Each structure stands twice: as C-alpha cells, then as structure tokens.
C-alpha cells in the first residue's frame, strides 16, 4: 500500500510546502508504509519541507536519504548527488530548532534552469516505533518526487567565475590583476545576479542584502532602505566553492543604481546594477 499526496503551492509567495511529519509519525496507525508526493516547480520557486530529527518523540530511529540532505538529492530517484551538479546555482538551507526538534529544508530553484531535471528525497521513519494502547505502531516513509522545468531566460548579470556561463549573460574566467566592472541595466520582472569564488571578499556584507548606493556617494545601505518591491537570495559558499546572489524587481517605481564588489589580493570584480522602471531589455 503506497499512498499519494500533494505539496501545497502558495501562488502569492511562489512557495511549495510538503507536510510530512504527521504522515510518517510512529504514534498513529496508517495504511500506507510509503507515501509519494509529486511536485513540479520552475525557476525561482521555493520548496519548504519540515522534517523531524530523531530527538523528536516517535521519531527516535528516523533518518533521511540522502543522509547529507542539505547538499544532496537522489538523482533519477536512486543515487545521491550534490544538487549543485544537476541544478547549478541552487540554494538550499537546512535549519534546526534546538527546542522543537523540527528542521526546515528550503530549496530555491535558481532564476534560470538550463536542463529539465527530476530528483527525489526520502524521509524514512520505518524503524521508529511507539507503544500506543498496547499496540506497537511503526513509522512510515515519505518520498518527495521533484520535477523542474527548463528556465526560460539567462540571468542578466555577472558570472565572475567563468563556471556559470550557461546561467548568466556576462561570463569570464577570472585572471590575475583584474579590474573588471560588469555594468547591468534591468527593468521590472528581470533577474540580475552574480557569481564569485567564495574565498573572495564580498562587499558590502551579504550583497545584495546591503549595497553601495551609487546615488549617495557609495554609502553602504540595506537594500530595504532603497526598495521594498524586490526579491533576492544568496548563498555564500555552495558545494563547488562559489558565492551567488540573485535579485529581481517587481512593480518598483524609483530608478535605482547600486553596486557590489568581490575582491582579493589579486583582482577586483564590481557589479553595478542600474534598475530603470521604464527600461525595456533588448
């Protein structure tokens, strides 16, 4: 008996959430030993999965496959692989609440998907048991099958690594003693972003969360001080060793100009974004 279920998609936030804890709990009788969730996503979507740790009561023998869930998925539903290798520019976070013993896995699909992919994740509580009313009840397994559609449009921004040429418009392998400034102009509903080596220093801190305001003598300002109609995301160091940041404007009226820098003892790389509400990209 393999059951089936769906992951709720919030249309407003573009967020899919899969609710598995009550499905695999060992304290309640269930008729499916394994439940299958199927979800299809596209570029920039987010997938949120709350899942237990085995400190949580009725999940004492729980485990995840792939075991390194933060970094990996099951390719073709069987073999572990770094999600970066099949979905370059992916961002995952894996947060643990020390008090509730619940964790939250979050996967951001990057702003452009170069190839159609499928992969899965398994949350296996089949070894956990609870004695409830003199019945020994076992936990269950939830498997999430994820399909991601091809990504529509390359990012209009700056790959300073030379390794994401398939993802960004500007892409150049970094050479010593470089003073490169990548100029970008974007209108609404258009992705920008950048990739650097993670050992480069990114200024200001966690760009674009703070940026140099070009229209105010390059003062460091939080992006929220310049706009509140913008979505962004960031990973400081993915499993390949790269930093990426992504940014997109939605119904922003004010013309904005800002920058960020990735610098080392050898080179400087600057991304300068001009956002123009009336700009129409060619």
């Amino acid at each position, epitope marked *: 008996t393999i059951g089936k279920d769906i992951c709720k998609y919030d249309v407003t936030t573009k967020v899919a959430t899969c609710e598995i804890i009550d499905t695999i709990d060992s304290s309640v009788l269930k008729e499916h030993h394994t439940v299958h969730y199927s979800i299809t996503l596209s570029r920039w979507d987010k997938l949120i999965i709350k899942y237990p740790t085995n400190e949580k009561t009725h999940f004492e023998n729980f*485990f995840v496959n792939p075991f390194n869930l933060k970094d990996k998925v099951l390719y073709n539903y069987n073999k572990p692989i770094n999600i970066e290798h099949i979905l370059p520019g992916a961002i995952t976070t894996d947060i643990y609440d020390t008090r509730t013993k619940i964790k939250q896995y979050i996967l951001r699909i990057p702003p452009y998907v170069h190839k159609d992919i499928h992969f899965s994740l398994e949350f296996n509580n089949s070894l956990s048991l609870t004695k409830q009313n003199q019945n020994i009840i076992y936990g269950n397994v939830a498997k999430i099958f994820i399909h991601i559609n091809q990504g529509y449009k390359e990012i209009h921004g700056c790959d300073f690594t030379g390794k994401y040429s398939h993802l960004f418009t500007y892409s150049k392998k970094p050479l010593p003693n470089d003073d490169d400034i990548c100029n970008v102009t974007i209108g609404n509903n258009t992705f920008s972003g950048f990739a650097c080596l993670s050992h480069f220093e990114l200024k200001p801190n966690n760009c674009f969360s703070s940026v140099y305001d070009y229209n105010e003598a390059n003062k460091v300002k939080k992006l929220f001080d310049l706009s509140t109609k913008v979505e962004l995301d960031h990973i400081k160091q993915n499993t390949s060793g790269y930093t990426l940041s992504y940014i997109i404007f939605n119904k922003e009226s004010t013309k904005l100009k800002f920058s960020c820098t990735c610098s080392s003892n050898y080179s400087n790389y600057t991304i300068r974004i001009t956002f123009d509400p009336n700009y129409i990209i060619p």
Partner: nanobody
Framework: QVQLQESGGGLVQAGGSLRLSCAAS??????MGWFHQAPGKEREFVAS????????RYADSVKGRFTVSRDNAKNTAYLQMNSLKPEDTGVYYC??????????????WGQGTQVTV
C-alpha cells in the same frame, strides 16, 4: 561543543577483527556516529547510537559485522569491527551531535584512524 578523539586502528585480513574507541571531553546527551572515508570519497555513514543507547542504526552494508556501543559514565563510544572485508579499508571518524538522523546533526568530529583490510 565536544572534543572528540578516536583510537584503535589496525591492519588485518579478510575476516579479522578490530575495536575503535572514541573519547569525549556533555557527551551523555549527544548521539554518536561512526563514519568511513575511503580514498577519494566522502565520509560515509557507518553507525549511530542515541545518547541512551536505546536507538542504533547501521549502514545496510555493515549489518551483522559491526557493533556500536557506548559508556556514558566514562564518556566513551566504541565500534567493534568483526569480519573485516577489504572494502572496509579507510579512515574511520567518530562524530557527535544532538541528533544523528541526517548529516547535519553531527557538529563535533574526531581526527580519524586508519583501518586496512
């Protein structure tokens, strides 16, 4: 967190036996795990044991051959390695954390000990 140090690595033949220990210097509220890294591979899950010893999990490939245990009073965990096969060669790490159900639970790591079959 917790300071971990392993010991007990050795060379043996297909069928030989070995016994690693791992010493902590708060151990008794952590799950412990053993991990194996062969050359050119990642640290692969071998075994885990809850803080109480009540919950134990083994990689499917070492079932029946290895036995994890622990001694909370003495802050020591053990891996008993029997029926050693040549694939078992590699570096063995002990690790500790609040949980062991996914790799991110393990916040403290030892330094590894070599096991050659």
């Amino acid at each position: 967190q917790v300071q971990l140090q392993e010991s007990g690595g050795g060379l043996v033949q297909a069928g030989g036996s070995l016994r690693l220990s791992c010493a902590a210097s708060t151990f008794s509220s952590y799950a412990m795990g053993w991990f194996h890294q062969a050359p050119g591979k990642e640290r692969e899950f071998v075994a885990s044991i809850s803080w109480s010893g009540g919950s134990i999990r083994y990689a499917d490939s070492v079932k029946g051959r290895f036995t994890v245990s622990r001694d909370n009073a003495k802050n020591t965990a053990y891996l008993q390695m029997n029926s050693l096969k040549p694939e078992d060669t590699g570096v063995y790490y002990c690790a500790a954390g609040p949980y062991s159900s996914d790799y991110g639970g393990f916040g403290s790591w030892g330094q590894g000990t070599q096991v050659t079959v």
